[PDB]
Scaffold this active site. Structure first.
Site, mmCIF file in Angstrom:
data_model
loop_
_atom_site.group_PDB
_atom_site.id
_atom_site.type_symbol
_atom_site.label_atom_id
_atom_site.label_comp_id
_atom_site.label_asym_id
_atom_site.label_seq_id
_atom_site.Cartn_x
_atom_site.Cartn_y
_atom_site.Cartn_z
ATOM 1 N N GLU A 85 16.433 10.588 0.922
ATOM 2 C CA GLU A 85 17.043 9.081 1.542
ATOM 3 C C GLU A 85 17.463 9.018 2.833
ATOM 4 O O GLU A 85 17.832 8.029 3.548
ATOM 5 C CB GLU A 85 17.970 8.615 0.571
ATOM 6 C CG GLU A 85 17.621 8.383 -1.116
ATOM 7 C CD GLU A 85 16.327 7.363 -1.100
ATOM 8 O OE1 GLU A 85 16.085 6.611 0.001
ATOM 9 O OE2 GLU A 85 15.686 7.353 -2.371
ATOM 10 N N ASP A 94 14.261 -0.968 4.102
ATOM 11 C CA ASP A 94 13.522 0.079 3.276
ATOM 12 C C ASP A 94 11.941 -0.054 3.389
ATOM 13 O O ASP A 94 11.656 -0.915 4.245
ATOM 14 C CB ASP A 94 13.970 0.188 1.855
ATOM 15 C CG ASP A 94 13.542 -0.889 0.911
ATOM 16 O OD1 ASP A 94 12.585 -1.756 1.116
ATOM 17 O OD2 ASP A 94 14.160 -1.182 -0.132
#
Length: 485
Positions: A85, A94
């Site tokens: 991440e 994202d």
């Protein structure tokens, strides 16, 4: 089972090594390495060899430094997700286009940036203005990990599988429930049955087919292999996609094989040797059964040579006080052999610390004043050429000696061999006989290795015929010679 009838001198040294162990004079691990390198000694305590067990390799299962990592078990989930991440301190979108912040923390699926921003103040407890700190993101991180762990155990479809998984796989399942959440992972129902039954090569295909993976394959493939192989190898060195995962010892030995056939004799003799030493790093399991002692470890065994310093050390002196032409010419001839070696085996790591120099009408040849030893060769034999040659170059190319055209002497030694396809064939067979002994050997992986090597020889052949320098040789566009089958 260590025997070498082809090299009775090598075998004799090995017998001194073993015998010295019997007498409890154990090989001691070098700290000036960063892996499982040991100094083998004889009964008199002198250092006869350097030993590098396969399983203590940097990607090695039993490397002491990374054993601590393996202790953590599932608890590596924090680091595992940190790698996937990353860390950002300000709101971003994202892969799917959804507003995210900190470490993989999804704020909302809304297109509105202030939805995310409102939702963000709730979480942190203040007015963030879309920017948080490292610690705040860390605080979010734990809760999201907790939420995942909770999500799995609260779910009827998910929980059974989880309990049947080893500590490492469990971490992989959490990884998924971190990205897709509880409900999403439970639509994988096929693979969960399979995963539960322990069939790894079964599930790894089905995970390859999902709404997931398609969106984030670079990450997804990293988990699939964490499920399949039950290890962390995919999160270790995912930038050396150029080299085979844990075959450095074979590289070491292979380099010495090549040297032998080309008759370079810059590579101190290195072979595959089995040893047991109380000083090595063994599994707890193994340790107990010894009370019929420790099992032998498979490794590279390289003869120790005396009188040498780092290449850097000598050239520094030679720059201030230049060698006489005739001496200096002995250096250059030694240098070419190095250049020929590294290019052929396509070394990816060679610095001025990685090779060593020694500077001191008849039936016999006068001793050479200067001589070159090539050590630390376990990072060669890549599956393919590096994506950016600047990242993994040939360092010696920037040395002035690389500017000087190849001597006729080297051409006479090496061209008759590498122009003969039956030599290159035989050379490839010898490498095959070495590499195939590894449990993790793969015929397809091998062919790619040979392909690079066949392409390097291809380049070197024409370089030698044109009397090009070493520098002009590396500027030649890298090629591979691939078999169609």
């Amino acid at each position: 089972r260590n025997e070498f009838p082809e090299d009775p001198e090598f075998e004799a040294v090995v017998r001194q090594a073993e015998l010295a162990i019997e007498r409890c004079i154990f090989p001691e691990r070098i700290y000036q390495g960063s892996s499982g390198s040991y100094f083998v000694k004889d009964p008199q305590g002198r250092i006869i060899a350097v030993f590098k067990p396969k399983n203590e390799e940097p990607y090695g299962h039993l490397n002491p430094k990374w054993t601590k990592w393996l202790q953590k078990g599932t608890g590596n989930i924090f680091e595992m997700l940190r790698i996937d991440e990353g860390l950002r301190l300000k709101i971003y979108k994202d892969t799917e286009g959804y507003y995210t912040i900190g470490i993989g923390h999804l704020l909302t699926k809304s297109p509105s940036l202030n939805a995310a921003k409102s939702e963000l103040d709730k979480a942190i407890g203040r007015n963030t203005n879309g920017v948080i700190t490292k610690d705040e993101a860390e605080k979010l991180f734990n809760q999201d990990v907790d939420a995942a762990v909770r999500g799995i155990l609260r779910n009827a479809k998910l929980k059974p599988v989880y309990d049947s998984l080893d500590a490492v796989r469990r971490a992989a399942l959490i990884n998924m429930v971190f990205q897709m959440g509880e409900t999403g992972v439970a639509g994988f129902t096929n693979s969960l049955r399979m995963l539960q039954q322990k069939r790894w090569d079964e599930a790894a295909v089905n995970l390859a087919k999902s709404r997931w993976y398609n969106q984030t394959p670079n990450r997804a493939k990293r988990v699939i292999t964490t499920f399949r192989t039950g290890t962390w190898d995919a999160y270790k060195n995912l930038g050396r996609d150029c080299l085979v995962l844990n075959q450095g010892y074979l590289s070491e030995a292979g380099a010495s094989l090549v040297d032998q056939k080309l008759e370079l004799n810059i590579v101190p003799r290195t072979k595959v040797v089995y040893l047991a030493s109380e000083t090595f790093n063994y599994s707890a399991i193994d340790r107990v059964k010894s009370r019929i002692g420790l099992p032998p470890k498979v490794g590279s065994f390289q003869l120790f040579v005396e009188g040498y310093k780092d290449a850097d050390y000598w050239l520094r002196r030679f720059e201030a006080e230049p060698l006489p032409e005739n001496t200096n010419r002995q250096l250059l001839l030694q240098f070419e052999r190095l250049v020929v070696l590294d290019y052929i085996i396509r070394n990816t790591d060679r610095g001025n610390d990685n090779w060593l120099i020694k500077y001191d009408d008849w039936v016999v040849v006068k001793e050479p004043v200067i001589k070159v030893a090539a050590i630390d060769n376990g990072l060669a034999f890549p599956l393919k050429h590096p994506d950016s040659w600047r990242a993994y170059p040939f360092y010696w190319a920037w040395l002035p000696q690389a500017k000087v055209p190849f001597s006729q002497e080297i051409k006479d030694l090496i061209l008759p061999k590498i122009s003969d396809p039956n030599f290159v064939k035989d050379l490839e067979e010898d490498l095959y006989e070495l590499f195939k002994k590894d449990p993790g050997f793969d015929r397809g992986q091998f062919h790619k290795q040979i392909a690079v090597m066949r392409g390097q020889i291809l380049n070197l052949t024409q370089a030698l015929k044109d009397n090009k320098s070493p520098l002009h040789l590396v500027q030649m566009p890298p090629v591979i010679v691939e078999t169609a089958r």
